[PDB]
């Protein structure tokens, strides 16, 4: 009864589409045309960071919003003082093909990973005056694409084997495997309460997962290409996706369908990194066209352009207090914008 | 500025010095990426992830990286490598190799990245050419069953498959068994790319 199972799946998909269409009764542009526009917000490079000698692929801000960690292609993980441009640490990595990096909320550990399929956890606070490898989490089959900390002992990772994983760092074991994607999972984002998380993949889809249950609650499919970036709204009840189709899309979790699309005819390039601002009003998206764009989340109008990078902007992040936006590109340079 | 901040700045300068000396030590290295369908293990010194093979030849250090669909997800990591060593079996499969070369030699990041193409298993192809005609996969040959002529024909649809043959160059070499021959061929190739880079840096070119 393979045809019967296919028909049942098609009927379930049709019922899901019918329920989603029944939920739609007013587009967000209709309820948002009344609010005032944000204007022409212009940000300047208040700081620049030099010292990387290859393409920068990842960065992560700290909870203190002053320490920064950046990963480059020369096998180098640098911890920077953003205020004074001083390099706190220069960790040499075993593998030089690092694609993601994370900073623990407590500030004691930094994670990295990439084509070696291993999530390396580095301890920063030691009795000796050096940074030591604390753990090497292994078990993923494909390349490690994104890692995010929940606490000092738990970390969630995404990979190219179409799965996401939860690790107890002390035991170093696969606590929970998250399954259901078809294409390569490219990015992760964690809810503010650290109980749910969303993953975007190359199958033009995003999935919401419970950390404590290991099951996929909702699947969102609006795009038409590989989703490269993902980020929750500061509310925690919505998220934003960016893909190679030069299109961002804001989904709401309770409405279970797409709420807004951000696109322009002049913008024809992939999207590498998407993050929000503190209030959620402002969305920042890095593109392949050597600069970043700044959209208004409640009305898809391109409010600003952050330009000054001589190569493709590969990563961008926003501080916890929202007073700085740091971008890293392939020109071996980091820039803090405000 | 505080005394602690001054000492922190001095520490940052020391990190700068270590970064500079590491760059000076590593600038004598050549970035090679090994791809194929099929004899990748016959060229290394003639779920894990990458395999790094480091070998030295005539004061050049070379690092080959084995990464053995959706290969475009991690292909941006090798967007600035010196050369791509591609492997292909004459006695192969052939359609898959042609498709892989389609994806590689016309890629966005590899428009100006040189290709060193190896046509390995020459004795196997010599034994197979007399037995099986060329019409098993390419029924357009209509030529002699000589091993040299068969190799020259199979070299096409690989070397003639590229586009924009004025910027990058594809090198062809049947895989020999005289030890220090293939490494010398790769040495000559990377010497050519290094000469081009030096010309561009000096700006006269």
């Amino acid at each position, epitope marked *: 009864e393979l045809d019967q199972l296919r028909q049942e799946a098609e009927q379930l998909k049709n019922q899901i589409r019918d329920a989603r269409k029944a939920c739609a009764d007013a587009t967000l542009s209709q309820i948002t045309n009344n609010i005032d526009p944000v204007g022409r917000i212009q940000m300047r490079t208040r700081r620049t960071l030099r010292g990387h000698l290859a393409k920068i692929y990842a960065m992560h801000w700290g909870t203190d919003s002053r320490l920064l960690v950046s990963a480059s292609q020369d096998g180098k993980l640098i911890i920077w003082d953003s205020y004074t441009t001083n390099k706190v640490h220069a960790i040499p990595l075993r593998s030089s093909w690092v694609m993601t990096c994370a900073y623990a909320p407590s500030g004691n550990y930094v994670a990295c990973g990439g084509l070696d399929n291993i999530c390396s956890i580095y301890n920063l606070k030691t009795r*000796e005056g*050096n940074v030591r490898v604390s753990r090497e989490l292994a078990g993923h089959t494909g390349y490690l694409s994104c890692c995010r900390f929940l606490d000092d002992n738990q970390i969630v990772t995404s990979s190219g084997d179409t799965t996401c994983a939860l690790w107890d760092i002390e035991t170093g074991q696969q606590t929970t495997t998250f399954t259901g994607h078809t294409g390569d999972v490219m990015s992760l984002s964690l809810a503010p309460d650290t109980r749910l998380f969303v993953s975007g993949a190359c199958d033009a889809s995003a999935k919401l997962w419970d950390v404590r249950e290991g099951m996929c609650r909702q699947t969102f499919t609006g795009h038409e290409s590989d989703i490269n970036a993902i980020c929750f709204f500061p509310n925690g009840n919505a998220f934003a996706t960016g893909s190679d189709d030069a299109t961002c899309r804001l989904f709401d979790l309770r409405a279970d369908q797409e709420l807004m699309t951000y696109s322009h005819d002049n913008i024809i390039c992939g999207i590498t990194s998407v993050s929000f601002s503190k209030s959620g009003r402002l969305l920042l998206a890095g593109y392949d066209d050597f600069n970043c764009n700044v959209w208004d989340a409640l009305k898809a109008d391109r409010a600003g352009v952050l330009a000054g990078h001589d190569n493709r902007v590969s990563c961008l992040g926003v501080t916890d207090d929202g007073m700085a936006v740091a971008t890293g590109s392939w020109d071996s340079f980091l820039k803090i914008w405000n | 500025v505080s005394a*602690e*901040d001054k000492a922190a700045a*001095e520490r940052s300068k020391m990190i700068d010095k270590n970064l500079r000396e590491d760059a000076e030590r590593d600038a004598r290295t050549v970035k090679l990426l090994l791809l194929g369908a099929s004899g990748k293990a016959t060229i290394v010194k003639q779920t894990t992830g990458i395999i790094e093979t480091q070998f030295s030849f005539k004061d050049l250090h070379f690092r080959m990286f084995d990464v053995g669909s959706e290969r475009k997800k991690w292909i941006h990591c090798f967007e600035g490598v010196t050369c791509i060593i591609f492997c292909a079996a004459l006695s192969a499969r052939m359609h898959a190799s042609l498709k892989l070369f389609d994806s590689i030699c016309n890629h966005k990041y590899f428009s100006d990245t040189s290709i060193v193409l190896f046509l390995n298993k020459k004795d196997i192809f010599q034994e197979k050419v007399t037995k099986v005609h060329l019409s098993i996969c390419f029924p357009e040959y209509t030529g002699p069953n000589t091993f040299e002529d068969a190799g020259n024909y199979i070299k096409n649809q690989f070397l003639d498959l590229n586009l924009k043959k004025e910027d990058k160059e594809i090198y062809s070499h049947m895989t020999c068994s005289t030890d220090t021959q293939n490494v010398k061929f790769v040495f000559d190739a990377v010497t050519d790319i290094i000469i081009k880079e030096n010309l561009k840096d000096c700006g006269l070119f």
Partner: single-chain antibody
Amino acid sequence: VQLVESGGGLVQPGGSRKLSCSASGFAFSSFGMHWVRQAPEKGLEWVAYISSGSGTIYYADTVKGRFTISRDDPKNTLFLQMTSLRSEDTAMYYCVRSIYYYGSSPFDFWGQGTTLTVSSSDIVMTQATSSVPVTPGESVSISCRSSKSLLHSNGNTYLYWFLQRPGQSPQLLIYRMSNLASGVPDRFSGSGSGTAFTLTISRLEAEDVGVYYCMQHLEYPLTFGAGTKLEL
């Protein structure tokens, strides 16, 4: 982590001696290294400092022109060469490590020290109280005063607290105020501003008896204060 000092002994006035200190258990090359001094019945006094990589060298005014500080990083050793000794140099010498960045813990480990006997402007740190009685289980407040405000423009206040137990090398409790050092129980707290400074012990035990020393790290020559002795 071990800093074992060697040298010392009886030297006639006008003589010379070399003190060595061997470091074993940490990255010696990444730590700035200090020489500190205690007179036999008096408090602490800074002598010298050598940076990581020997880029910056600093001396006290008294030991200037007579004392040389150096390090051998491959040998993991620190050296102090003393020439033209006077009778005011009869003291015990400690060797201290200090790594420097915002959020680090300078002066966090101290050596055992060696005894030298000889025959025959600056921020003043004042601790007026001395030899105050304590009762176990109670709360003790220790005051500390300065001459210049130690609050810098970057928000950092450079007051360091140390504990010299009877017959033991000084420890570190607080490096910047409200920053508690590693290995210290959560009953020590530090609070102050500008000139005034306070250390609070909520519930002291039998292992918290000794002499409490202040230090300023705003500017050299890193003056200490005459400590407060706790007595049961």
